[PDB]
Amino acid sequence: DVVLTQTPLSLPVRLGDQASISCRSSQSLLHSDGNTYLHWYLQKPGQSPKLLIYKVSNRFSGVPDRFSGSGSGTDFTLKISRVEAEDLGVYFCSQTTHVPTFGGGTKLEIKRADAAPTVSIFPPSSEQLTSGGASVVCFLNNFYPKDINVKWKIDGSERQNGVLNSWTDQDSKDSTYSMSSTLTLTKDEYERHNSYTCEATHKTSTSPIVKSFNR
Amino acid sequence: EVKVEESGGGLVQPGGSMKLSCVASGFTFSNYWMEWVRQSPEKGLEWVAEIRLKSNNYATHYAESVKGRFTISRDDSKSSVYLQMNNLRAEDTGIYYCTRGGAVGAMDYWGQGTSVTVSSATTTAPSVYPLVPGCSDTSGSSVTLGCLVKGYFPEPVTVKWNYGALSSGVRTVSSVLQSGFYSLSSLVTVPSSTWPSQTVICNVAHPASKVDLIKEPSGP
Numbered sequence A: 001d002v003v004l005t006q007t008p009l010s011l012p013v014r015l016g017d018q019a020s021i022s023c024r025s026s027q028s029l030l031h032s033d034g035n036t037y038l039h040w041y042l043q044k045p046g047q048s049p050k051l052l053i054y055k056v057s058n059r060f061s062g063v064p065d066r067f068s069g070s071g072s073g074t075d076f077t078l079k080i081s082r083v084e085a086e087d088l089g090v091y092f093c094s095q096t097t098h099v100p101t102f103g104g105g106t107k108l109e110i111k112r113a114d115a116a117p118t119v120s121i122f123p124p125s126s127e128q129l130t131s132g133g134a135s136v137v138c139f140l141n142n143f144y145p146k147d148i149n150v151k152w153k154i155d156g157s158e159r160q161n162g163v164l165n166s167w168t169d170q171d172s173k174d175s176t177y178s179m180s181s182t183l184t185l186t187k188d189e190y191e192r193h194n195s196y197t198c199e200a201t202h203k204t205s206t207s208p209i210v211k212s213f214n215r
Numbered sequence B: 001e002v003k004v005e006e007s008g009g010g011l012v013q014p015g016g017s018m019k020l021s022c023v024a025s026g027f028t029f030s031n032y033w034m035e036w037v038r039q040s041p042e043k044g045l046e047w048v049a050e051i052r053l054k055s056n057n058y059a060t061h062y063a064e065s066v067k068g069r070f071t072i073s074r075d076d077s078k079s080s081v082y083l084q085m086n087n088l089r090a091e092d093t094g095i096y097y098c099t100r101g102g103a104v105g106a107m108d109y110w111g112q113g114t115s116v117t118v119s120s121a122t123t124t125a126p127s128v129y130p131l132v133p134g135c136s137d138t139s140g141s142s143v144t145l146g147c148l149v150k151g152y153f154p155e156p157v158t159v160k161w162n163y164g165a166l167s168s169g170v171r172t173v174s175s176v177l178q179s180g181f182y183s184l185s186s187l188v189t190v191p192s193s194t195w196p197s198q199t200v201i202c203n204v205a206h207p208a209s210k211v212d213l214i215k216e217p218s219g220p
């Protein structure tokens, strides 16, 4: 088949700045009829891919003049000037000269100003207790960069196992992230202790953002 | 104005069968070739099949990997195109998109997609617990509420608030697979006045089990 390799794999870019995605194929995409069917697509979080550029450089309908494409042999490039929030997502290149193939994709991330997190701690709901486990959730909302560390303390003692951390995709509006840390204990483990504390350490601070509840 | 909508996904065993449907609207369906493209986290986007026009005797073309197992067909009168899948394998797992063969030489319009999971593990509907304030002082954008969706399989699960009416400041982390099950969280932030005075509920949908779960977070 025709292989399409895209670079970079991840692309951090500032608002209003310029981004450049490349796509290289394993063979020539020039068709006998003289056209080159290399296209670009944008896939936003949760949404399906949308066509931006067709036949190397033709912009699709509604596609702003900020998106432009070019080609040269087996090398192709997608360019986005004046990058803006709504531009985040994964850009793919694809060809239809031969059996259709797609590139691996390039995630475009919005490099924005740091934002300190807002912490909320939710003790377990009594509705969960009969499951045999209890989940204490520490929600860190609207922060940036993505990197963050959450530590859990049960009655002063740090607890490492039983924790599951997961992030949201970058927000289309303010370009921040949110993440939740979930500490899951056996029901009785949870009742043999009274103070549950989660400490979050983010680039936006030295002192840990602490949130805790007592039963 | 061009609209494409697929359906028919879910969990299947290996080597079972499954049929997907796609309904288009907004354009003279009969004048265009139609495609099926799937996306998996193991092989990324992969073209599966194509079916041309009436004048073309509905010529069909399949990717080498599905040739002899998948069959694509269309019905110009009802503006639909289908994908019959047999002897499914774990590799066939992924999101399947229906797309139009654009006049411009590329697949121009894609549907939202429908997920397919080929596995020997069975379906498990999610359990939903309320995430409530946790009784504290207002110091984090005014009150944050949420729904903890645990123990479901397979993916995906969609979460909405107030049936979609509430969409500002909604945050949903991605799922994580552990102990053989997925789980995620979805939280929303609202003014400490518009609650509990007003009604806030989360709508958790799980296609594979065809369940829609509606839960309202009360002060409790």
Ligand SMILES: CO[C@@H]1O[C@H](CO)[C@@H](O)[C@H](O[C@H]2C[C@H](O[C@@H]3O[C@@H](C)[C@H](O)[C@@H](O)[C@H]3O)[C@@H](O)[C@H](C)O2)[C@H]1NC(C)=O
Binding pocket: A031, A035, A037, A096, A097, A098, A099, A100, B033, B050, B061, B100, B101, B102, B103, B104, B105, B106, B107
């Ligand atoms: C091996 O040739 C390629 O086979 C694929 C699988 O059947 C086709 O998807 C692919 O077609 C291309 C181009 C097609 O656009 C129409 O046909 C071309 C020739 C015209 O130039 C154009 O104006 C349209 O009428 C498009 O719909 C599909 C999705 O991709 C085919 N390659 C070519 C170059 O035909």
